[PDB]
From a paper:
Our goal was to solve the structure of the [name] S-layer directly from whole cells. Using subtomogram averaging, we mapped the locations of the S-layer repeating units on the cell, which were arranged in a hexagonal array. The central region of the S-layer hexamer in the map had a resolution of 3.3 Å, with the resolution decaying to around 4.5 Å towards the periphery. Each monomer of NmSLP in the S-layer adopts a rough ‘cashew’ shape, facilitating several interactions around the hexamer of NmSLP.
[name], like most archaeal cells, is encased by a paracrystalline, proteinaceous surface layer or S-layer. Collectively, our structural data reveal that the S-layer of [name] functions as a multichannel exchanger for ammonium ions, featuring negatively charged residues that line several pores in the S-layer.
Numbering used by the authors:
A (entry chain C): 1374 to 1498
B (entry chain B): 868 to 1301
C (entry chain A): 446 to 1012
The structure:
């Protein structure tokens, strides 16, 4: 529920409705019709794919790493660049997100048009 | 390509009816899409990039571009068995058909990896048990395994160099250089090439466990994916990459923090070789020099000479690294530095890109002698045991180091007991091994 | 009743079956290959052959990075008819290890007007993934008027940089030899000549000395008018010197391979050219694995078991190099690279991921060219030397039993080890070879020594045996007066002889003399002996077998101890 910066979060989704094929590992968040929206309080990633853990399990799993922001000397040595602040990634495993030291994670999932289920998290020291 | 039954089992002649195509006998489908090789004038699509699907498949080395390419045909088991057996090998890359509503088929401009997709066959039965057309097929999935990377040891010793790796004048003491000479009495006013330990480039072996690359269950396999393995050294907020593995072996320099966008300028260690024909584990032997590390001001004690990694014979900094070290700082490895290996799995259990990491920490430990007993009869056998971790440079082999590191100190004489000692010394002990 | 013929491939399975649980040195073990694709005749025996283009696939084994024909990519090969001329290395050059004799310039004139299209005979080039064989596809013209003499082939983008990784400088390395193996039997030429070309420009088309002077020298002769198309010859030091004999940048100069032959006036549809480079040896102390290298490629000529049997049978031989033969080029040149029972060199106890693995491509039943491979470990053993008794009398006929399977270098011949008799060399009166290099672990040529009172037993010889001791009689004269003809190890004729063809245990013996001459000091060569002899009774007789490769595969000094009893 609570994360720090330069941390990785495992996102799990239990969506039996999207298990379209038993012999095919189904995916969500790939298209604009079925989007996955991960977001902080200032940064977000669009069209983030999520992958089923099993071929016929109905559970989708993926992780995103919070890269933080480069405008801080966390180590205290006197130079920036302690965290490679970069927002990128569209697959299920290569998501990179920038996050302030005081921020909040938000993951939103859509199962039908004009309907969205969301999840929340917070960022502290 | 002209006939609507292209890449389908059957005959070229085909008529369109209410039950499909007359000439269509058996089809194989990935993600409910017929697997066909790009051909004709409808395969000009290039997709998100400028490379055509057929050219992409040719570059990937996949000669199984379609059912016809594999030569898959149905053959009866016997003269009158009535059971037909056919087979083919699943390619790693396939070209998806954009639309099946036109002949010849219009193919997509980019290929996709078949892992995770469901492979389905469809045998068109002209006469069912009641004697009419019934569509029957079977379903299966193209499995894939998550990649994993492992390192031999949790910790590794700090590598050391020789006198020839420093531009400083000859001295009887290291003077802060990365030199490992004998105890002072073994040196005569100047440390030369005959009175120091050989180069201490530790050889780390990287191992991955990816069953996907084990295409041959009882044959040689090699990880041919380009730049799938990244070897790097990190010291806090700064990072340096040793090189890349998986692509063809090539000459290159050392990049710092991945700043060099062009990947062809990075050193390549070649393709990893499978340890055993039925193991699926690939091992690559790579040696790390004492200079292959992030720049720091603590290493200015040695005016380091950097061995060239490119084709030039110069000893300058730019010969080994993409950029010169900062003024007042030199590339090196300190105690506590973290050694990490990066491997990008082209297909995990979900059949996509995945990054796995393993980490090791550089460390230096004290040395302590030991003996089987305290008292010894003159002329007896002394089992001189040295226990010290940092001399284990390679875990796959047992190295040897000069006995001159130990010294004799007694009322009789003071000598290093080795070849650098006094006349007649080394003969007196008769080391076994030397 | 009609009957049909079905065309279908099969899945192969190459297996290596050792006669026991360990593949020790000097043990020929069968290699079994079951492949129905190569059984193309049900009424005869099909033997694999590199020289036969019909035999498409041959199993291969390689170690290190040998310089094959395709190290620089896909080569380009052409054929040419004409005369070499007087300013050519093929005619003037000869094998004499001389710079002028073996290194020069290559010139030619081309007269291809009578040929088809009046152009040089180009060809289609293909390379096998494991045997590395080059298959040349061209027009199968066999007319009587056809006459071709030359053949020039370029190794793609290969340069001196791609050659120096395998070819080493024999003058600078402590131990190093270069070998050239070629197979041109498919050409059917009466005489074969091969030369190495180096130039900073393109090889095709070729140039002449009278035309341009860009390169000071561009020809290095290797083979001159050999009557055998199959040959595994040791390259002379001149070739190694010429490889490093140019001051220009090695990456800026390309390499080319030249052919001159006669009696080849007919060319088949497919022709095969196989000629690689071999290299073995070590540098400086040679204890670490980084300085040990053995670059070679081995191809097995499997022979069909029966007329209609898909099982092809072969065998593999391997010799584990020791401290005695590491400095002799004959043991490296004595192996067979291309034969039904080939042999190869092993420099280190290759186990686990580095174990000797044989590779063989195959067309499976599905139709893919999947490879099948097998490997067998070739570890080392810790040599153990001991004496039959704890104590010995005068002339008790002591016998030395050495059990170490790595010294067996042939399962056919009886392996023996003589004793060195040469005062100049530092290994005088020691088992081994006259050649000896000084390293951190002692002497390279020192295999086994016998010591009384921890002093090596050697016969007085040379100019350092003039000492007379407390009396006026020299040690050699004193021994002669005493009637002791066993003045040293060499005098007794003590040599190591293997118990059997492949036992791996060596037995040697000698009689303990009553009087022996003590060596005053071992710090000089030849040894300086004491002026008086002393009776060996009561002294401890100790042997020392120098083990080049221990169980972990490195040098460990092991010996045994005994005393000369007296009553």
């Amino acid at each position: 529920k609570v994360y720090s910066w330069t941390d990785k979060v495992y996102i799990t989704i239990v969506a039996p409705d999207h298990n379209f094929d038993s012999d095919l590992v189904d995916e969500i968040g790939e298209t604009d019709s079925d989007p996955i929206k991960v977001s902080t309080r200032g940064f977000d990633l669009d069209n983030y794919k999520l992958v089923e853990t099993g071929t016929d399990t109905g559970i989708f799993t993926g992780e995103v790493i919070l890269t933080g922001f480069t405008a801080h000397d966390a180590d205290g040595d006197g130079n920036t660049g302690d965290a490679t602040g970069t927002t990128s990634g569209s697959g299920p495993t290569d998501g990179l997100l920038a996050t302030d030291d005081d921020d909040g994670l938000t993951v939103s999932f859509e199962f039908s048009e004009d309907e969205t289920i969301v999840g929340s998290a917070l960022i502290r020291w | 390509n002209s006939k609507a039954t292209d890449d389908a089992v059957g005959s070229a002649t085909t008529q369109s009816l209410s039950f499909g195509e007359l000439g269509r006998l058996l089809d194989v489908t990935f993600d409910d899409v017929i697997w066909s090789t790009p051909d004709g004038a409808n395969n000009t699509a290039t997709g998100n990039d400028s490379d055509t699907c057929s050219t992409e498949l040719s570059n990937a080395g996949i000669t199984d571009t379609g059912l016809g390419a594999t030569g898959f045909t149905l053959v009866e088991t016997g003269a009158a068995t009535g059971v037909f057996v056919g087979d083919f090998q699943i390619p790693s890359f396939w070209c998806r058909v954009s639309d099946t509503t036109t002949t010849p088929y219009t193919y997509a401009g980019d290929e996709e990896t078949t892992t995770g997709l469901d492979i389905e066959v469809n045998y068109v039965d002209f006469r069912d048990a009641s004697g009419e057309i019934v569509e029957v097929g079977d379903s299966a999935g193209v499995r894939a395994n998550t990649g994993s990377v492992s390192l031999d040891r949790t910790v590794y010793p700090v590598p050391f160099g020789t006198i020839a790796d420093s531009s400083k004048a000859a001295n009887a003491a290291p003077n802060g250089r990365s030199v490992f000479p004998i105890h002072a009495t073994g040196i005569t006013s100047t440390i030369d090439s005959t009175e120091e330990l050989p180069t201490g480039d530790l050889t780390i072996h990287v191992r991955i466990n990816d069953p996907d690359f084990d295409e041959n269950p009882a044959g040689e396999d090699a990880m041919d994916q380009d730049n799938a393995l990244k070897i790097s050294v990190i010291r806090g907020s700064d990072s340096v990459v040793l090189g890349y593995a998986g692509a063809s072996e090539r000459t290159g320099k050392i990049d710092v923090g991945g700043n060099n966008g062009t990947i062809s300028n990075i050193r390549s260690f070649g393709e990893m070789d499978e340890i055993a024909p039925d193991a699926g584990i690939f091992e690559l032997d790579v040696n790390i020099k004492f200079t292959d590390g992030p720049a720091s001001a603590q290493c200015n004690s040695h005016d380091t000479l950097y061995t060239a990694l490119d084709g030039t014979t110069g000893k300058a900094d730019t010969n080994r690294f993409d950029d010169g070290a900062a003024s007042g700082q030199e590339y090196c490895i300190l105690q506590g530095d973290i050694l990490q290996v990066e491997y990008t799995d082209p297909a995990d259990a979900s059949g996509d890109a995945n990054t796995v990491t393993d980490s090791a920490t550089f460390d230096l430990r004290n040395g302590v002698l030991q003996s089987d007993k305290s008292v010894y009869i003159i002329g007896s056998d002394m089992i001189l045991t040295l226990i010290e971790p940092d001399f284990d440079l390679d875990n796959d082999s047992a190295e040897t180091y000069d006995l001159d590191l130990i010294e004799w100190d007694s009322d009789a004489a003071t000598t290093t007991m080795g070849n650098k000692g006094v006349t007649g010394a080394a003969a007196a002990f008769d080391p076994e091994p030397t | 009743t009609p009957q049909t013929i079905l065309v279908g491939f099969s899945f192969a399975s190459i297996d290596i079956q050792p006669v026991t649980d360990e593949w020790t040195s000097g043990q020929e073990i069968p290699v079994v290959i079951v492949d129905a694709d190569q059984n193309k005749n049900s009424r005869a025996d099909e033997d694999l052959d590199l020289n036969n283009p019909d035999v498409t696939l041959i199993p291969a084994l390689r170690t290190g990075d040998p310089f094959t024909i395709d190290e620089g990519g896909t080569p380009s090969l052409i054929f040419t008819n004409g005369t070499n001329g007087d300013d050519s290395i093929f005619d003037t050059g000869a094998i004499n290890n001389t710079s002028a004799g073996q290194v020069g310039n290559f010139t030619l004139n081309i007269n291809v007007t009578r040929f088809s299209s009046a152009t040089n005979i180009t060809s289609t080039e293909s390379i096998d993934t494991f045997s590395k064989r080059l298959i040349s596809a061209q027009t199968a013209n066999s007319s009587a008027n056809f006459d071709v003499d030359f053949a020039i082939i370029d190794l793609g983008s290969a340069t001196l940089e791609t050659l120096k990784e395998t070819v080493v400088d024999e003058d600078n390395t402590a131990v190093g030899f270069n070998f050239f193996n070629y197979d041109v039997r498919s050409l059917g030429a009466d005489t074969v000549s091969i030369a190495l070309l180096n130039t900073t420009g393109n090889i095709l088309p070729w140039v002449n000395n009278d035309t341009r002077n860009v390169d000071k020298n561009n020809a290095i002769l290797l083979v001159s008018n050999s009557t055998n198309s199959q040959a595994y010859v040791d390259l002379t030091n001149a070739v190694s010197d010429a490889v490093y004999g140019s001051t220009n940048t090695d990456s800026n100069v390309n390499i080319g391979f030249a052919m001159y032959f006669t009696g080849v006036g007919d060319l088949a549809a497919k022709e095969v050219i196989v000629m690689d480079f071999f290299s073995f040896g070590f540098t400086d102390d040679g204890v670490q694995s980084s300085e040990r290298f053995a670059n070679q490629i081995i191809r097995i000529e499997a022979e069909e078991t029966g007329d209609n049997t898909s099982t092809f049978e072969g065998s593999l031989e391997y010799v584990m190099v020791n401290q005695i033969n590491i400095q002799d080029a004959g043991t490296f040149s004595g192996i067979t690279p291309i034969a039904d029972d080939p042999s190869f060199i092993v420099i280190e106890d290759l186990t686990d991921e580095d174990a000797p693995r044989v590779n063989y491509n195959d067309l499976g039943a599905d139709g893919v060219t999947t490879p099948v491979s097998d490997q067998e470990e070739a570890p080392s053993h810790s040599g153990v030397v001991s004496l039959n008794a704890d104590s010995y009398k005068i002339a008790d006929t002591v016998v030395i039993t050495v059990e170490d399977l790595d010294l067996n270098v042939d399962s056919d011949l009886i392996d023996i080890f003589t004793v060195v008799s040469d005062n100049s060399k530092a290994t005088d009166d020691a088992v081994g070879s006259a050649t000896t290099q000084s390293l951190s672990f002692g002497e390279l040529g020192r295999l086994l020594d016998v010591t009384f009172d921890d002093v090596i037993w050697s016969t007085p010889d040379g100019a350092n045996n003039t000492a007379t001791g407390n009396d006026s009689d020299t040690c050699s004269t004193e021994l002669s007066n005493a009637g002791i003809t066993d003045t040293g190890l060499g005098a007794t004729g003590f040599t190591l002889v293997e118990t059997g063809a492949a036992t791996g245990v060596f037995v040697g013996d000698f009689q303990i003399p009553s009087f022996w001459c003590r060596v005053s000091d071992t710090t000089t060569t030849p040894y300086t002996y004491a002026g008086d002899e002393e009776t060996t009774t009561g002294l401890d007789i100790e042997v020392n077998y120098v083990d080049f490769r221990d169980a972990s595969g490195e040098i460990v000094e092991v010996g045994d101890s005994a005393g000369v009893r007296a009553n």
